Amino acid sequence: SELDQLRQEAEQLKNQIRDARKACADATLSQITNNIDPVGRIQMRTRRTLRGHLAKIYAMHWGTDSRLLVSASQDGKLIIWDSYTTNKVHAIPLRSSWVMTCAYAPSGNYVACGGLDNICSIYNLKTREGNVRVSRELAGHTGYLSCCRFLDDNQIVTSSGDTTCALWDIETGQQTTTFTGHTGDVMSLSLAPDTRLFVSGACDASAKLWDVREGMCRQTFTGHESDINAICFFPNGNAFATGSDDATCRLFDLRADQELMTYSHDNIICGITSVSFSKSGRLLLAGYDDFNCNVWDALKADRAGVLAGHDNRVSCLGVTDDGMAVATGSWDSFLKIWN
């Protein structure tokens, strides 16, 4: 049968990819970085507590100026905070509730909300009237829109719940490219510092490194047993870490094409709802479901510290582009700015 013989050559391709990765497995990251000096204790304390949401916070995103941060409440308000003066710089009511993602453009001019209404709405900020208006309601997804990011003020990559992630252009309000390589509901994405490649992850434990210009999936990473909930790049763009519901963070490479290090403690059984890296990348910050945020040594896989400051689970975590502080927005309507 032709279908079964192409499936058999597909498993031939899978097995040759697997033994290629095992041939590339010359050592492990623990063996390479065993002799480095340990981090020890990361005693960051809550410096500010942004408290203005009436529901669960579901996403946050800093700005590239490392001062403003946008936050998406479950009830349907994007509050754009100053992390310095603890002041709501903007407050945006949304047309529908249950937004799971918000994105801050690197220029600072745009924010983007997305939820289970299958529409990524782009709100302009620096208008002449001063009011925040919805610029474009990017619609065309059928599933829930799960993680949106800005490449620049016209290109926005939106994961969705119909196993796709689409790159949209805003001025025409369309999909320039669609990325359909997943079988599960795509739960996260994270752009690289190169802003030309990004990893999206779904419920099928597959993290695809795509490529935004050519439009096809460059490579595919497995290793989890549950839904991958959050992905974040390393600060150089050469590696990325995923946090899934299997209580494991996994740092994969992009040039070694396989998993470099796992992060799990036996005390931790809770799923990871957010991950990000420090500015040096030495500290992998992971917001779990045990109401905490563990900061792991990303080269020795030791739990360097714990951040226990929330009454509900930590939906969104994020480090500034200057690496100064980490906003751990949680479901208890708090945004604690640890530093």
């Binding site: 669960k56 249950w98 289970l116 209404d117 509901d185 419920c203 009454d311």
Partner: protein
């Protein structure tokens, strides 16, 4: 008095914070502003104006009892309560605004689960557990057992067994709870960690298909054979199929899903395989019975229908003991089958211009259970079978467990949320539509409360160190002799919204016609239905109507002796309506008529409830006639105090009108919770106003009966409304124009963080 002061303190907090122009407004003392404070003179004057205490020494005695019982405190805390113009701040507002602080009412987990009612087999229940990764998962389930008939898969993290939260318990103690539950032979209700979308890799046997797949868009599992490899893989009945084998089939029919299997394309009409077919609903089971009277794997992802969204909180109680709460929102499993039975019963009564129409609607309701709840119809669609179901019907349960062989005191309180019964599209069809839309929610709330009672969980009187067993038993004989009372508080605004005004007129005539239905129980146990315990059967006419509840052997042996002989059981109704907002810009007579209609049906609900209270007094009088009176004097003065407050709310004397604000909504719920009543909460949409009333009534029941510390009553009623359940109802609806009521009182408003 001094022992009733906790009930009166929760009641006066609920009456002070639920009025429009607040008496607890922030006041400045010594050029230092104090937030959410109440002067003693204005509190005592408000008490004597309301009618709580008749004299000022009675009012200051109430106040000093409150300050010793922890409800309020002086803002400098150098003084006891006296009739002075000094400021006394409530502890709940002090903890919410954050003015040594320890948080008592916290949240311990958020869960998504599925209830699995398992009858006990001979050697054990049909499964055994283990501790894997510091939790409690199923070690194994025996094949063909009633556990896998219910749908227990290996490896699922189990949350509760018989409304006892085990995931915070040690493994030896949960194993002891299982074996004592088996040796006492309790039908095991349990909640396991079930995700929404399930990737089942079913085996494709080359001869016959061990499953039935019916439906149009999406298709669902119509049946699954007992002990099959389908049941071993995890395909339980009722699961709607979204994708098969990679191919998206949520828009595809049933042959487009069966054709992916190897045995169906070998033999099409005859590939069932002679199995013990369990089904999804009892109507599907009886229709199927009346009709019949290496390894190629198929990996398909299905949607787990009838899931239960819960949040477990915990708190230190009043008397020191740590206590746990599980709040679940549950779509009623017998919703569509119930309205289908009502529509075919109305067709049988009519049998002609609508009989074929009604049976076609019943066929449309048995055809699919996709959503599985009727969302608010966006389009003015033509007359379907769907718009006879209760729109956005949900059941909010708290199962609360606190320690006192392992002594625990479980309880289970049901509060039914629903959008008001609408007909957005002759008038007899309209009245039958709203009648069915109300009666389905009535039968579902009474079913949840009845199985909670027969499982020995219900306790309307938990104030009095009364265990749930005897409290549920006295509720059973109480509801048997007196009848069942449906308290359904409407939160809609007839003065503001035209469609809500006609909704309230329609539900008023619907309850004036629905109070002659009777719930006559019966025993008929059928094992090849997946999880349901009660099976309904609606017989009768439009005017008089009987609903027959078929129960299991345990839940019929625990039933009171009067209704076991097929005796009738009338349902009386009560419609306490109150607008959650005030009225700014006082309106025309065209809205004063709506306000007078709201007051009229609130008065009729008050007279029906005091009729039921007089009958309840007569029943307790005859029970005491044939220790008991000295134990029953304590609930009866509290409940007629609540009746006096209800009469003050409904019919105030001329001179002080409107000064109570919107305090009917907590106090009517307290009164019909002290009284044995099925408590539905309805509004126009189902999400925001209804979860405000649900959060307040639930925190009031925990602070009243189960001894939640009054420092945490506002903390509980806002944690449950922001970061608890009943946000998934907004998730699943998401296409309505509902917003939170802005001009709502401080109790029925979300507290901004300090």
């Amino acid at each position: 008095e001094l022992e009733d002061i906790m009930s009166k303190g929760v009641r006066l907090y609920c009456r002070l914070h639920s009025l429009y122009t607040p008496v607890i407004k922030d006041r400045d003392y010594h050029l230092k502003t104090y937030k959410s404070v109440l002067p003693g003179s204005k509190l005592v004057d408000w008490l004597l104006a309301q009618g709580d205490c008749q004299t000022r020494e009675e009012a200051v005695a109430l106040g000093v009892g409150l300050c010793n019982n922890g409800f309020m405190h002086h803002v400098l805390e150098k003084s006891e309560f006296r009739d002075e113009s000094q400021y006394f701040r409530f502890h709940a507002d002090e903890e919410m605004e954050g003015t040594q602080l320890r948080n008592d009412f916290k949240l311990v987990e958020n869960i998504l689960a599925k209830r699995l009612l398992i009858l006990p087999q001979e050697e054990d229940y049909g499964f055994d557990i283990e501790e894997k990764n510091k939790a409690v998962v199923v070690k194994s389930v025996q094949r063909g057992s009633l556990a896998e008939v219910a749908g227990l898969q290996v490896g699922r993290k189990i949350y509760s067994i018989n409304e006892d939260l085990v995931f915070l318990r040690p493994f030896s103690e949960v194993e002891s709870i299982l074996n004592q539950s088996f040796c006492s032979r309790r039908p095991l209700r349990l909640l396991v960690a079930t995700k929404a979308k399930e990737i089942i890799k079913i085996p494709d046997q080359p001869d016959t298909l061990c499953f039935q797949i019916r439906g149009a868009a999406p298709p669902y599992v119509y049946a699954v054979g007992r002990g099959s490899e389908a049941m071993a893989a995890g395909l339980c009945a009722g699961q709607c199929i979204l994708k098969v084998n990679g191919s998206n089939v949520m828009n595809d029919g049933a042959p487009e899903v069966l054709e992916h299997f190897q045995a169906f394309r070998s033999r099409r009409e005859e590939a069932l395989g002679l199995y013990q077919w369990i089904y999804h609903t009892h109507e599907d089971a009886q229709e199927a019975r009346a009709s019949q009277e290496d390894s190629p794997m198929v990996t398909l992802t299905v949607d787990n229908v009838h899931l239960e969204h819960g949040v477990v909180y915990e708190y230190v109680s009043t008397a020191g003991v740590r206590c746990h709460v599980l709040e679940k929102i549950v779509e009623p499993r017998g919703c569509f089958g119930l309205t289908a039975k009502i529509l075919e019963a109305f067709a049988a009564n009519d049998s002609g211009q609508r009989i074929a129409c009604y049976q076609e609607f019943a066929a449309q309701l048995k055809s699919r259970v996709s959503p599985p709840f009727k969302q608010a119809p966006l389009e003015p669609h033509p007359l379907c079978g769907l718009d006879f179901c209760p729109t956005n019907c949900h059941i909010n349960l708290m199962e609360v467990s606190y320690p006192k062989l392992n002594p625990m005191s479980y309880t289970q309180h049901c509060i039914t949320t629903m959008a008001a019964p609408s007909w957005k599209c002759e008038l007899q069809l309209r009245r039958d539509a709203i009648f069915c839309q109300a009666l389905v929610a009535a039968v579902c709330t009474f079913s949840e409360q009845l199985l909670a009672a027969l499982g020995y969980r219900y306790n309307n009187n938990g104030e009095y160190e009364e265990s749930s067993r005897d409290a549920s038993r006295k509720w059973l004989e109480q509801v048997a002799a007196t009848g069942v009372l449906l308290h359904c508080q409407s939160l809609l605004s007839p003065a503001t919204v035209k469609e809500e005004r006609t909704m309230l007129e329609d539900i008023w005539v619907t309850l004036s016609e629905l109070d002659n239905v009777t719930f006559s129980f019966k025993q008929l146990d059928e094992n090849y239905v997946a999880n349901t315990n009660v099976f309904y059967h609606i017989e009768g006419s439009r005017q008089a109507l009987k609903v027959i509840f078929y129960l299991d052997s345990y839940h019929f042996s625990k039933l009171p002796s009067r209704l076991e002989g097929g005796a009738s059981l009338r349902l009386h109704t009560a419609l306490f309506t109150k607008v959650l907002e005030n009225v700014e810009g006082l309106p025309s007579p065209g809205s004063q008529a709506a306000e007078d209609l709201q007051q009229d049906i609130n008065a009729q609900s008050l007279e029906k409830v005091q009729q039921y209270y007089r009958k309840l007094r007569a029943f307790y009088l005859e029970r005491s006639n044939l220790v008991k009176i000295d134990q029953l004097i304590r609930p009866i003065n509290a409940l007629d105090e609540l009746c006096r407050l209800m009469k003050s709310f409904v019919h105030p004397k001329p001179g002080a009108a409107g000064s109570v604000g919107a305090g009917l909504i907590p106090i009517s719920s307290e009164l019909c919770y002290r009284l044995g009543a099925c408590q539905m909460v309805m509004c126009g949409t189902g999400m925001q106003r209804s979860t405000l009333s649900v959060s307040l009534e639930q925190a009031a029941i925990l602070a009243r009966s189960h001894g939640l510390l009054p420092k945490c009553i506002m903390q509980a009623t806002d944690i449950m409304r922001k970061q608890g359940p009943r946000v998934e109802i907004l998730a699943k609806n998401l296409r309505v124009k509902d917003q939170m009521p802005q001009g709502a009182p401080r109790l029925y408003r979300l507290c901004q963080p300090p």
